[PDB]
Design a protein around this ligand. Structure first.
Ligand SMILES: CCCCC/C=C/C/C=C/C/C=C\C/C=C\CCCC(=O)O[C@H](COC(=O)CCCCCCCCCCCCCCCCC)COP(=O)(O)O[C@@H]1[C@H](O)[C@H](O)[C@@H](OP(=O)(O)O)[C@H](OP(=O)(O)O)[C@H]1O
Ligand SMILES: CC(C)CCC[C@@H](C)[C@H]1CC[C@H]2[C@@H]3CC=C4C[C@@H](OC(=O)CCC(=O)O)CC[C@]4(C)[C@H]3CC[C@]12C
Ligand SMILES: CCCCCCCCCCCCCCCC
Ligand SMILES: CCCCCCCCCCCCCCCC
Ligand SMILES: CCCCCCCCCCCCCCCC
Ligand SMILES: CCCCCCCCCCCCCCCC
Ligand SMILES: CCCCCCCCCCCCCCCC
Ligand SMILES: CCCCCCCCCCCCCCCC
Ligand SMILES: CCCCCCCCCCCCCCCC
Ligand SMILES: CCCCCCCCCCCCCCCC
Ligand SMILES: CCCCCCCCCCCCCCCC
Ligand SMILES: CCCCCCCCCCCCCCCC
Ligand SMILES: CCCCCCCCCCCCCCCC
Ligand SMILES: CCCCCCCCCCCCCCCC
Ligand SMILES: CCCCCCCCCCCCCCCC
Ligand SMILES: CCCCCCCCCCCCCCCC
Ligand SMILES: [Ca+2]
Lengths: 163, 411, 146, 49, 162, 188
């Protein structure tokens, strides 16, 4: 109940998170190595790069398990799912699990969320998080320019419809 | 795809006109369907308002954000740290020149009275006085300027005599610059040679030039264009001008916040990679149309990454959009695949501008404050020293004024 | 009319330009007589605007002199006609506020002139690298098989 | 027209020879580095100045 | 005396490489600037304790010729260390106005003086606490030329006065 | 734009229109409005390099044009110089507009501005207590007092002296006593 919650927090020791970083980079390299062919064709290397997935989903389930047992989940006001980045990692790993459901409608869309794995580099490097927030805090004022742009687009679109 | 047949189609074509990509082709279409007498009143106001006025609004809002963010407690603290480091370096350089003059006088008085070591040290001091001279400066600048002239005249179908002349001149200039680097390292000392960043750049460029010579000996065809970077040493022509302070402080600020620039160019890289992978999922392999496969496809990762980069630069993003729509069934059923390109040219046009304008504004304002503050300190110290010596013997830009006001507000 | 070189509208506008050139050269001789030429400061040719007005008037006069309708030279007369476009660049020394705007633009150009030099040097370096890469290689056939 | 210049640059075989599609694709780095410097960095340096 | 005895202090303790060399550069500037008008002499007698007394009278007969005298003392690192003495030398103070650049100087000056970094910085701080009036001349300059010209202007003023 | 349109007419105005080139029925130099439309096209960067290539030397001249060879290699300088001159003037206009409103673009919520004055105007509709709750001799001296409460120049008599000094600095245009009238009401 709490015997391992006292111990799994030391499991967030730097070699572990660096191993997570390395497996994330490996996943990104595997994604980069894939080639897409038109009408159901697959390259011989795509078969290997598709069979390498369960290792990555397993390691991400392992990080999720550690970060949910060592930390909280939602309740304690400080927990796994209450961090914005850990929500993204949870979504990625959950869709990785759902990608091994052996169904039809899952693959076409649950393979698309697999591209959010490079952003796990940001999620695992706090300096990149700080720089990302510095980027994104200068674009909150630009949302009002976004409203102006959308109003202008509607005005000229309605005029174009009329004419 | 580019029609006003519907509110969604009209919205899409007006948005494509906002980005100023293929907007004249749409105007020319309305110049054929109807007369050309009135169509400009729709498209030139459209371009001016949604493209030039909105870019002006974005620039103003972003520059105001950068001004507010610059005059914050932690950013101001980091700038004061950089300014203090620059002042400390100035003082240390002056005192090092003092101590080297003492070295020279001690060596002279000792020689007037280990002989090999004394001769070696006097020769080293003579070289260190020579490489620091104004004549060495100008002879090196003339050598560099003659070297850029040599690589500027390389053209197609140049005379065979010119090719061999420049082949041997490259060796001559590489040997001259290796001699110059060795002389500078011997006189100044290897620890003091690499003290200035531009000498580090010169060393890297000469190493790359040697490597390029070796590789051209191995494989004649390949040229890396590394021996051209010696032309950057013409930037010392600025040392004999009153503009050395501003440009040097710009480079100081860049090298200071380099670990923030590299981490900015990597978040852009990660976003480009994420969008390239998403485009690979959406359009990977689906661009094999009849009679043509576009080179701007998402089939491989290099292809997708170049396509996403080209959409970020904005050029011909609409043609790639038309391909990505026609790959999912045409206008009838593939038109919701235009959201990839709308998002990639909206949140990529303005994140690019945000990041690079932030880099430029932060570093240029740091350079401005650094050079202005060193001039102010120089004048204040001059006044204090003149007044005390007499004792013992007996405009501003809108940005700078607003920055001062924000400083007072924050304090 | 850029294309109808002998149209009646161009024929009328050439007489109009005769009138405008007469007025401009009259004002030219007035300024020469009043201010005085380059022999002293505070006179004509001390301002680049004055030199602009002089070159416009002189070019128009040379074009009129060449207008013998002999056809001996055709490129020269057309270029001298193109020289007329500096004529609306006269209303900028006359208007004080337009001149203030022009001086602000020139001050901005002087402000960015140092980084303009750096930009041009860097682009020259990339031009030389690109020549070392792609020199003689941008050749192709209309027959993509050769 | 920069995508066409990039296409001509990658599809560039040798001096005085015709193109070859997909050849020398590593020469896209010249235009990526060029874009990071002049259109992105230097132009924004002018805008800031 | 007729002419006040020129003595340097301010970087750090005497004997140490940085202080000895900065003061020697100043001394050599004085010597090749005031040749035939100034006298350089090395003194091993602790003037603060006023064999010691043998040298002070020697200093007078250098100073009793209406000519400037420069003192190469090796035991004074303080202005008030010579306040109780009848000689009352001019205290030209070479002020390094920041311990950081002085520490960098010490570290740069080989490895021998780095082992005495703490005591030397402590001595520099000790001189820093001293009121500026205790020192006759303040040399805040970073450049050799500026400090030398300041000292030379003061010496010309003193020569004109005397 | 006017200068470059006139030069475009006079140098490239007689090039023959060709739908397979960039000098068309759509993008020619044949009139002021057509040349000016072409320059707007090039300012926004719409294959301006292709227009410049179509404007080079040795083009097919127009049927009704007396010239034999039309277009010139002056097009290189024409288009390059127009591109960076227009970009520079766009940038100067943009920066002039931004620096005109740089106070608004750097506006802070805590600091006041036109919004506070408009809010106190709306207070007209006692209500001053509610406004001070909602905060960041009838309505003008009250505005002076509000500015005094916001920004600070005995203490109160010194404030009145500074107010009179500022009023003397900013004396109105042909007013008998306009700001001085507000001063007696703004003293307290
Ligand atoms: C950042 C966004 C995206 C990236 C785009 C970057 C785009 C690149 C543009 C960024 C900077 C360009 C704008 C500013 C241009 C500089 C003009 C003025 C030159 C300048 O600032 O000087 C350098 C620049 O060093 C470089 O790196 C030279 C510049 C090399 C640029 C290539 C570097 C490699 C690029 C990647 C790294 C920095 O200043 P410095 O400190 O090195 O100058 C020293 C220093 O002043 C010493 O005091 C001086 O000795 P003394 O004065 O005699 O006491 C030294 O003289 P000596 O060597 O003879 O002893 C100088 O060389
Ligand atoms: C201080 C630094 C920036 C030196 C740069 C000087 C440039 C302004 C000069 C130096 C060499 C010149 C080049 C030398 C040789 C040529 C090749 C020449 O090409 C031909 O002769 C084409 C016909 C043929 O194949 O013979 C065209 C001009 C050009 C680029 C010259 C243009 C002006 C250049 C670049
Ligand atoms: C606080 C941190 C919130 C991070 C949100 C991450 C979203 C990643 C982009 C998905 C599209
Ligand atoms: C300075 C802004 C330039 C843009 C104005 C160009 C107008 C082009 C209109 C061309 C269409 C024919 C006009 C018929 C009336
Ligand atoms: C028979 C007319 C055919 C062409 C119709 C186009 C007219 C467009 C008029 C301009 C619309 C106003 C733009 C909104 C902002 C100025
Ligand atoms: C901030 C800009 C970063 C963009 C980096 C990626 C741009 C495109 C790179 C293309 C790499 C091509 C490699 C070809 C290998 C066969
Ligand atoms: C908000 C931007 C809109 C982008 C998508 C446009 C979708 C319009 C297509 C659907 C309308 C009916 C199409 C069938 C007739 C061709
Ligand atoms: C960043 C968000 C981009 C989301 C793009 C959504 C595209 C969905 C696919 C387009 C519809 C295809 C339907 C027909 C398939 C043959
Ligand atoms: C000297 C160039 C004049 C013309 C400028 C055209 C556009 C320049 C910016 C390129 C746009 C790319 C996206 C934004 C880059 C910060
Ligand atoms: C048709 C032939 C006559 C045209 C005369 C010129 C039209 C008006 C332009 C006057 C400009 C001053
Ligand atoms: C201080 C007065 C200088 C003279 C006026 C020069 C103004 C700048 C003109 C630049 C554009 C002229 C037309 C160029 C067409 C290619
Ligand atoms: C000089 C200032 C005005 C610019 C005029 C351009 C030069 C004359 C026309 C080009 C030469 C003939 C093709
Ligand atoms: C395989 C040979 C070509 C490799 C790719 C291009 C190499 C050169 C890239 C640009 C180097 C200039 C750096 C920036 C200097 C200011
Ligand atoms: C038919 C004419 C062929 C080309 C003749 C002109 C060559 C290029 C002229 C470039 C002039 C540039 C500066 C002019 C304005 C300052
Ligand atoms: C195509 C054959 C050679 C053409 C030679 C004429 C060159 C035109 C003059 C270019 C002037 C510089 C343009 C850029 C502005 C600095
Ligand atoms: C006349 C001197 C040469 C031009 C120098 C600046 C030209 C490009 C400036 C940027 C233009 C686009 C506006 C800002 C876009 C982010
Ligand atoms: Ca375009």
């Amino acid at each position: 109940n709490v015997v391992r919650k006292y111990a799994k927090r030391i499991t967030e020791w730097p070699p572990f998170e660096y191993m997570i970083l390395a497996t994330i980079i490996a996943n990104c390299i595997v994604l980069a190595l894939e080639q897409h062919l038109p009408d159901g064709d697959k390259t011989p290397m795509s078969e290997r790069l598709d069979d390498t997935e369960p290792y990555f989903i397993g390691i991400f389930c392992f990080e999720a398990g550690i970060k949910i047992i060592a930390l909280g989940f939602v309740f304690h006001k400080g927990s796994y799912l209450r961090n914005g980045w850990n929500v993204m990692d949870f979504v990625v790993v959950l869709t990785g699990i759902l990608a091994t459901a052996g169904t039809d409608f899952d693959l076409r869309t649950l393979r698309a969320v697999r591209v959010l794995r490079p952003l796990k580099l940001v999620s695992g490097i706090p300096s990149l998080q700080v720089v990302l927030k510095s980027i994104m805090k200068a674009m909150v004022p630009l949302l009002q320019i976004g409203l102006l742009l959308f109003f202008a687009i509607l005005m000229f679109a309605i005029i174009g419809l009329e004419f | 795809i580019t029609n006003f047949d519907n509110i969604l189609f009209a919205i899409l074509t007006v948005f494509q006109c906002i980005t100023m990509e293929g907007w004249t082709d749409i105007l020319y279409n309305t110049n054929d369907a109807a007369g050309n007498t009135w169509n400009w009143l729709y498209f030139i106001p459209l371009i001016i308002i949604g493209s030039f006025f909105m870019l002006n609004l974005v620039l103003g809002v972003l520059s105001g954000e950068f001004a507010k963010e610059r005059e914050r407690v932690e950013n101001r603290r980091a700038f004061l740290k950089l300014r203090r480091q620059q002042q400390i370096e100035r003082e240390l350089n002056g005192y090092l020149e003092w101590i080297f003059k003492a070295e020279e006088v001690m060596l002279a008085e000792e020689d007037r009275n280990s002989y090999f070591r004394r001769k070696e040290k006097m020769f080293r001091f003579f070289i260190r006085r020579m490489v620091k001279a104004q004549s060495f400066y100008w002879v090196v600048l003339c050598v560099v300027a003659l070297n850029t002239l040599c690589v500027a005249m390389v053209h197609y179908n140049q005379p065979r005599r010119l090719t061999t002349t420049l082949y041997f001149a490259e060796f001559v200039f590489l040997g001259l610059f290796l001699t110059e680097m060795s002389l500078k390292m011997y006189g100044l000392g290897p620890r003091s040679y690499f003290r200035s960043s531009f000498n580090c750049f010169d060393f890297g460029v000469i190493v790359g030039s040697v490597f390029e010579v070796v590789w051209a000996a191995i494989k004649p065809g390949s040229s890396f264009g590394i021996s051209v970077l010696r032309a950057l040493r013409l930037l010392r022509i600025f040392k004999v001008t009153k503009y050395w302070s501003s440009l040097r402080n710009l480079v100081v600020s860049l090298l200071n916040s380099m670990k923030s620039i590299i981490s900015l160019l990597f978040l852009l890289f990660l976003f480009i990679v994420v969008f390239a992978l998403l485009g690979m999922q959406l359009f990977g392999g689906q661009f094999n149309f009849q009679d043509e496969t576009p080179t701007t496809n998402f089939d491989t990762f290099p292809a997708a990454i170049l396509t996403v980069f080209q959409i970020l630069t904005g050029e011909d993003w609409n043609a790639v959009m038309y391909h990505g729509i026609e790959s999912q069934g045409g206008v009838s059923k593939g038109m919701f695949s235009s959201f990839y390109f709308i998002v990639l040219t909206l949140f990529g046009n303005y994140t690019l501008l945000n990041v690079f304008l932030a880099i430029a504004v932060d570093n240029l304002a740091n350079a401005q404050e650094l050079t202005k503050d060193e001039e102010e300190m120089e004048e204040a110290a001059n006044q204090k020293l003149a007044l005390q010596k007499a004792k013992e013997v007996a405009a501003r830009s809108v940005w700078e004024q607003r920055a001062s006001q924000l400083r007072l507000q924050n304090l | 009319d850029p294309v109808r070189t002998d149209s009646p509208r161009n024929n009328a506008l050439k007489y109009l330009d005769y009138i405008f050139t007469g007025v401009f050269t009259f004002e030219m001789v007035i300024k020469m007589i009043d201010l005085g030429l380059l022999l002293h400061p505070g006179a004509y040719f001390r301002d680049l605007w004055n030199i602009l007005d002089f070159i416009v008037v002189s070019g128009a006069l040379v074009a009129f002199a060449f207008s013998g309708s002999k056809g001996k030279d055709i490129n020269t007369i057309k270029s001298l006609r193109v020289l007329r476009v500096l004529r609306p660049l006269k209303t900028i020394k006359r208007l004080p506020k337009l001149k203030a705007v022009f001086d602000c633009v020139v001050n901005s150009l002087k402000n960015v002139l140092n980084i303009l030099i750096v930009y041009m040097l860097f682009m020259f370096i990339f031009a030389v690298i690109a020549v070392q890469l792609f020199k003689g290689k941008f050749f192709y056939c209309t027959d993509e098989s050769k | 027209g920069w995508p066409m210049v990039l296409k001509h640059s990658v599809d560039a075989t040798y001096e005085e020879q015709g193109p070859s599609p997909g050849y020398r694709m590593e020469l896209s780095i010249f235009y990526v580095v060029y874009f990071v410097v002049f259109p992105f960095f230097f132009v924004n340096i002018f805008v800031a100045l | 005396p007729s002419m006040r005895p020129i003595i340097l202090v301010g970087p750090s303790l005497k004997g140490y490489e940085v202080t000895d060399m900065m003061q020697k550069a100043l001394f050599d500037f004085l010597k090749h600037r005031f040749d035939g008008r100034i006298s350089i002499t090395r003194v091993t007698a602790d003037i603060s304790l006023a064999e010691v007394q043998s040298e002070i009278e020697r200093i007078f007969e250098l100073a009793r010729t209406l000519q400037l005298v420069a003192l190469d003392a090796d035991t004074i690192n303080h202005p008030a260390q010579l306040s109780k003495t009848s000689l009352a030398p001019i205290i030209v103070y070479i002020k390094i106005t920041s311990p950081k650049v002085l520490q960098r100087l010490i570290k740069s000056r080989g490895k021998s003086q780095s082992k005495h970094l703490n005591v030397q910085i402590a001595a520099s701080e000790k001189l820093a606490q001293c009121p500026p009036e205790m020192f006759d001349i303040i040399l805040d300059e970073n450049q050799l030329e500026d400090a030398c010209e300041h000292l030379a202007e003061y010496l010309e003023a003193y020569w004109k006065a005397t | 734009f006017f200068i470059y349109a006139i030069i475009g007419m006079q140098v490239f105005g007689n090039i023959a229109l060709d739908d397979d080139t960039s000098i068309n029925r759509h993008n020619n130099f044949r009139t002021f409005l057509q040349a000016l439309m072409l320059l707007f096209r090039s300012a926004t960067g719409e294959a301006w390099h292709e227009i410049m290539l179509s404007c080079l030397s040795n083009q097919a001249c127009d049927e009704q044009a007396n010239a034999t060879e039309c277009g010139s290699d002056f097009a290189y300088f024409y288009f390059v110089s127009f591109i960076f001159l227009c970009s520079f003037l766009m940038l100067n206009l943009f920066v002039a507009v931004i620096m005109d409103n740089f106070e608004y673009l750097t506006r802070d919520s805590s600091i006041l501005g036109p919004h506070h004055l408009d809010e106190f105007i709306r207070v007209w509709a006692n209500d001053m207590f509610e406004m001070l709750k909602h905060m960041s001799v009838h309505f003008t001296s009250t505005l002076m007092a509000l500015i005094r409460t916001a920004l600070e120049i005995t203490k109160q008599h010194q404030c009145d002296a500074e107010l009179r000094k500022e009023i003397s600095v900013v004396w109105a245009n042909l007013p008998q006593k306009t700001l001085d009238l507000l001063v007696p009401p703004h003293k307290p």
